[PDB]
Amino acid sequence: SLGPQVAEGENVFGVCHIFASFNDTFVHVTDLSGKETICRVTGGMKVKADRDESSPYAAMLAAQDVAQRCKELGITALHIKLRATGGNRTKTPGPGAQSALRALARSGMKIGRIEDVTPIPSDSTRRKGGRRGRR
RNA sequence: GUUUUCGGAACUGAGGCCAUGAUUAAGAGGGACGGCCGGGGGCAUUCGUAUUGCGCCGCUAGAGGUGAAAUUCUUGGACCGG
């Protein structure tokens, strides 16, 4: 676990994926390409209750935990990439989206580029739920 | 007996003549033509993510879903990243 660079020089960049759904959160971190992930921790592995897997708090300390994991490897600046549920479902990021990256903003990391990679379809398939919706 | 002058009837030929014969072109219609216009129609063709599945690769114990859960998937590696 040794990143070959001086601290007093430049910054090693990695990209993290915030998949903040409406029933869980993901703070997946990988390298600048994506074919090698460093640490992926979810909101569900931080509280033993289903109802708050997508709470902002369960995404606040899951952000601090992955932050400490990216310390001894040599990552100080990250790239944010938001993601809602995408597809035919919603495109608004979950309630755990706000406090996630704000936690790692106050957790020693640095921030690069922000992006929303919610996989917006061109022309959707049939969305789940009846014609009368969800009653 | 006979042809006609004779009235009537039919047909052919030359004409002369008519102020020689056809209303207008519907804020009715059809049609032609002109440059257009359009998620009109048919046939073909092309493209776009997404979804689902499969393969490989990464790291890992949870993932899903709910008002709250469970059924279901998961160290046989699920979910998540490529």
Curated annotation (Swiss-Prot):
Positions carrying Phosphoserine: S1, S124
Q: Where in the cell is it found?
A: Cytoplasm; Nucleus, Nucleolus
Question: Ribonucleoprotein as a keyword?
Answer: yes
Task: State the Gene Ontology BP annotations.
Answer: translation
Q: Which GO terms describe its cellular component?
A: cytoplasm; nucleolus; small ribosomal subunit
Q: Which Pfam families match?
A: Ribosomal_S11
Record keywords: Cytoplasm, Isopeptide bond, Nucleus, Phosphoprotein, Ribonucleoprotein, Ribosomal protein, Ubl conjugation
Q: Show the InterPro entries listed in the entry.
A: Ribosomal_uS11, Ribosomal_uS11_CS, Ribosomal_uS11_sf
Segments carrying the region annotation (Disordered) are 116-135
Basic residues composition bias: residue spans: 127-135
Q: NCBIfam families recorded for this chain? A: PRK09607.1
Record family assignment: Belongs to the universal ribosomal protein uS11 family.
Q: How does it assemble?
A: Component of the small ribosomal subunit. Part of the small subunit (SSU) processome, composed of more than 70 proteins and the RNA chaperone small nucleolar RNA (snoRNA) U3.
**Protein's recorded name:** Small ribosomal subunit protein uS11
